[PDB]
Amino acid sequence: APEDLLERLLGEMELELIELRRALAQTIATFKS
Amino acid sequence: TERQRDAQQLIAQRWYEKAQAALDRGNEQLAREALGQRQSYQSHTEALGKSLGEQR
Amino acid sequence: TERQRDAQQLIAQRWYEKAQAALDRGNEQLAREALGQRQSYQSHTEALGKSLGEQR
Amino acid sequence: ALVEQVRGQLQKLERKYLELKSQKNLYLARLKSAIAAQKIEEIAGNLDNASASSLF
Amino acid sequence: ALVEQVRGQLQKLERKYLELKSQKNLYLARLKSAIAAQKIEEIAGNLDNASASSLF
Amino acid sequence: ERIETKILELEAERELLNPPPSPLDKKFEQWEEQQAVEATLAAMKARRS
């Protein structure tokens, strides 16, 4: 069912896209430190 | 929403009275802080005024 | 999709007001950054405008 | 001499330890960004005539 | 000498204890503010086209 | 020391979430404020001088 994959794939894109946001937090923190 | 607009307008109106008397005697220096303070209220008035038209 | 077009148009319109006042008094230098900024929004408008016709 | 000589090693070594730790997080952060933020593009730009995820 | 030497340690140490305690509450207060007052923004500015809580 | 790292993280963990005004729109916001506070002010300066 390819149509369901669209939900699955775009879910993964959001699962790790936010994690990138978390990673950015560490980098900016070191700049302040 | 309408009740808030006039209230904020009155606060500016009250400061407008002091602003009206701020320059009285030529005390322009004091009016600078009063007028500079009022704009913090005028922006809210316009924001609510525009939003009021949308709800109509 | 239509809701996004006007919103981006309004942002350009808002910058258009500042752009309209950007050159007011002859401050052409400042308008350069404002106008240069708006084009980043106009391109989206045309892209959505063209796409809107396709969906019709 | 021994107590003076040995202390110098501890002081110099102690400074270096924290110096390495600072770079440890920095390289780790870059690795996380370039590995996590990278993976999305292999999900979006999949093998296709226009790299449109290959499903469209 | 011992009674004089030992007393100096107690006097100096006693002063330091309360000094640390003062900073303890201060850092705790900042932690509470930056952790409690912080959490609201993740409730208001949720992931959305305009960060309007994502529900509007 | 470790506590300060946590505070630094949180204060910076969300500044991106609510980005501050850019130096341009801040310059405009300030210039518009400067203008407003010196142009509406100028309007009030000449309106009821």
PDB file of all heavy atoms in Angstrom, chain E residues 28-39:
ATOM      1  N   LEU E  28      19.554  27.853  42.375  1.00  0.00           N
ATOM      2  CA  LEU E  28      18.299  27.112  42.384  1.00  0.00           C
ATOM      3  C   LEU E  28      17.158  27.966  41.851  1.00  0.00           C
ATOM      4  O   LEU E  28      16.331  27.492  41.063  1.00  0.00           O
ATOM      5  CB  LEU E  28      17.990  26.633  43.802  1.00  0.00           C
ATOM      6  CG  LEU E  28      18.872  25.492  44.308  1.00  0.00           C
ATOM      7  CD1 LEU E  28      18.842  25.423  45.825  1.00  0.00           C
ATOM      8  CD2 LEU E  28      18.426  24.176  43.703  1.00  0.00           C
ATOM      9  N   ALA E  29      17.099  29.233  42.265  1.00  0.00           N
ATOM     10  CA  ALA E  29      16.039  30.116  41.793  1.00  0.00           C
ATOM     11  C   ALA E  29      16.121  30.311  40.285  1.00  0.00           C
ATOM     12  O   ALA E  29      15.106  30.244  39.581  1.00  0.00           O
ATOM     13  CB  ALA E  29      16.125  31.460  42.515  1.00  0.00           C
ATOM     14  N   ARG E  30      17.328  30.548  39.767  1.00  0.00           N
ATOM     15  CA  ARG E  30      17.491  30.696  38.326  1.00  0.00           C
ATOM     16  C   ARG E  30      17.087  29.422  37.602  1.00  0.00           C
ATOM     17  O   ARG E  30      16.451  29.472  36.543  1.00  0.00           O
ATOM     18  CB  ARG E  30      18.935  31.061  37.992  1.00  0.00           C
ATOM     19  CG  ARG E  30      19.393  32.375  38.581  1.00  0.00           C
ATOM     20  CD  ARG E  30      20.881  32.573  38.372  1.00  0.00           C
ATOM     21  NE  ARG E  30      21.236  32.573  36.959  1.00  0.00           N
ATOM     22  CZ  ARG E  30      22.479  32.632  36.499  1.00  0.00           C
ATOM     23  NH1 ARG E  30      23.517  32.690  37.316  1.00  0.00           N
ATOM     24  NH2 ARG E  30      22.684  32.628  35.185  1.00  0.00           N
ATOM     25  N   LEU E  31      17.453  28.266  38.157  1.00  0.00           N
ATOM     26  CA  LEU E  31      17.062  27.003  37.547  1.00  0.00           C
ATOM     27  C   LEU E  31      15.548  26.874  37.489  1.00  0.00           C
ATOM     28  O   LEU E  31      14.988  26.474  36.462  1.00  0.00           O
ATOM     29  CB  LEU E  31      17.671  25.837  38.326  1.00  0.00           C
ATOM     30  CG  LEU E  31      17.182  24.438  37.945  1.00  0.00           C
ATOM     31  CD1 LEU E  31      17.489  24.144  36.491  1.00  0.00           C
ATOM     32  CD2 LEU E  31      17.809  23.394  38.848  1.00  0.00           C
ATOM     33  N   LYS E  32      14.865  27.220  38.582  1.00  0.00           N
ATOM     34  CA  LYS E  32      13.410  27.115  38.611  1.00  0.00           C
ATOM     35  C   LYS E  32      12.779  28.034  37.574  1.00  0.00           C
ATOM     36  O   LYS E  32      11.839  27.647  36.871  1.00  0.00           O
ATOM     37  CB  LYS E  32      12.894  27.449  40.009  1.00  0.00           C
ATOM     38  CG  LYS E  32      11.394  27.255  40.189  1.00  0.00           C
ATOM     39  CD  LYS E  32      10.940  25.847  39.830  1.00  0.00           C
ATOM     40  CE  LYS E  32      11.758  24.785  40.546  1.00  0.00           C
ATOM     41  NZ  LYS E  32      11.895  25.069  42.001  1.00  0.00           N
ATOM     42  N   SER E  33      13.283  29.265  37.471  1.00  0.00           N
ATOM     43  CA  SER E  33      12.732  30.209  36.506  1.00  0.00           C
ATOM     44  C   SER E  33      12.969  29.735  35.079  1.00  0.00           C
ATOM     45  O   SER E  33      12.044  29.711  34.258  1.00  0.00           O
ATOM     46  CB  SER E  33      13.347  31.589  36.725  1.00  0.00           C
ATOM     47  OG  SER E  33      12.912  32.507  35.738  1.00  0.00           O
ATOM     48  N   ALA E  34      14.202  29.341  34.767  1.00  0.00           N
ATOM     49  CA  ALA E  34      14.545  28.965  33.403  1.00  0.00           C
ATOM     50  C   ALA E  34      14.031  27.586  33.018  1.00  0.00           C
ATOM     51  O   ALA E  34      14.104  27.229  31.837  1.00  0.00           O
ATOM     52  CB  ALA E  34      16.059  29.019  33.213  1.00  0.00           C
ATOM     53  N   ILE E  35      13.525  26.807  33.969  1.00  0.00           N
ATOM     54  CA  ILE E  35      12.927  25.513  33.676  1.00  0.00           C
ATOM     55  C   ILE E  35      11.407  25.583  33.711  1.00  0.00           C
ATOM     56  O   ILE E  35      10.735  24.979  32.873  1.00  0.00           O
ATOM     57  CB  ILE E  35      13.452  24.442  34.656  1.00  0.00           C
ATOM     58  CG1 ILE E  35      13.113  23.045  34.139  1.00  0.00           C
ATOM     59  CG2 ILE E  35      12.852  24.632  36.034  1.00  0.00           C
ATOM     60  CD1 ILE E  35      13.556  21.934  35.060  1.00  0.00           C
ATOM     61  N   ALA E  36      10.851  26.318  34.674  1.00  0.00           N
ATOM     62  CA  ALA E  36       9.402  26.449  34.768  1.00  0.00           C
ATOM     63  C   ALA E  36       8.881  27.435  33.731  1.00  0.00           C
ATOM     64  O   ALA E  36       8.036  27.091  32.897  1.00  0.00           O
ATOM     65  CB  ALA E  36       9.013  26.893  36.177  1.00  0.00           C
ATOM     66  N   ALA E  37       9.385  28.669  33.764  1.00  0.00           N
ATOM     67  CA  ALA E  37       8.958  29.668  32.796  1.00  0.00           C
ATOM     68  C   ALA E  37       9.317  29.271  31.374  1.00  0.00           C
ATOM     69  O   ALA E  37       8.742  29.816  30.425  1.00  0.00           O
ATOM     70  CB  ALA E  37       9.584  31.022  33.121  1.00  0.00           C
ATOM     71  N   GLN E  38      10.260  28.347  31.202  1.00  0.00           N
ATOM     72  CA  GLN E  38      10.616  27.916  29.857  1.00  0.00           C
ATOM     73  C   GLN E  38       9.544  27.011  29.269  1.00  0.00           C
ATOM     74  O   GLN E  38       9.195  27.137  28.090  1.00  0.00           O
ATOM     75  CB  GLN E  38      11.965  27.200  29.874  1.00  0.00           C
ATOM     76  CG  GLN E  38      12.227  26.343  28.640  1.00  0.00           C
ATOM     77  CD  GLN E  38      11.791  24.900  28.815  1.00  0.00           C
ATOM     78  OE1 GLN E  38      11.322  24.502  29.882  1.00  0.00           O
ATOM     79  NE2 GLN E  38      11.939  24.108  27.759  1.00  0.00           N
ATOM     80  N   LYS E  39       9.000  26.104  30.083  1.00  0.00           N
ATOM     81  CA  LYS E  39       8.122  25.057  29.572  1.00  0.00           C
ATOM     82  C   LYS E  39       6.875  25.608  28.895  1.00  0.00           C
ATOM     83  O   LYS E  39       6.308  24.934  28.029  1.00  0.00           O
ATOM     84  CB  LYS E  39       7.723  24.124  30.712  1.00  0.00           C
ATOM     85  CG  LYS E  39       6.821  22.980  30.289  1.00  0.00           C
ATOM     86  CD  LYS E  39       6.890  21.825  31.275  1.00  0.00           C
ATOM     87  CE  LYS E  39       6.330  22.210  32.636  1.00  0.00           C
ATOM     88  NZ  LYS E  39       6.606  21.175  33.668  1.00  0.00           N
TER      89      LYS E  39
END
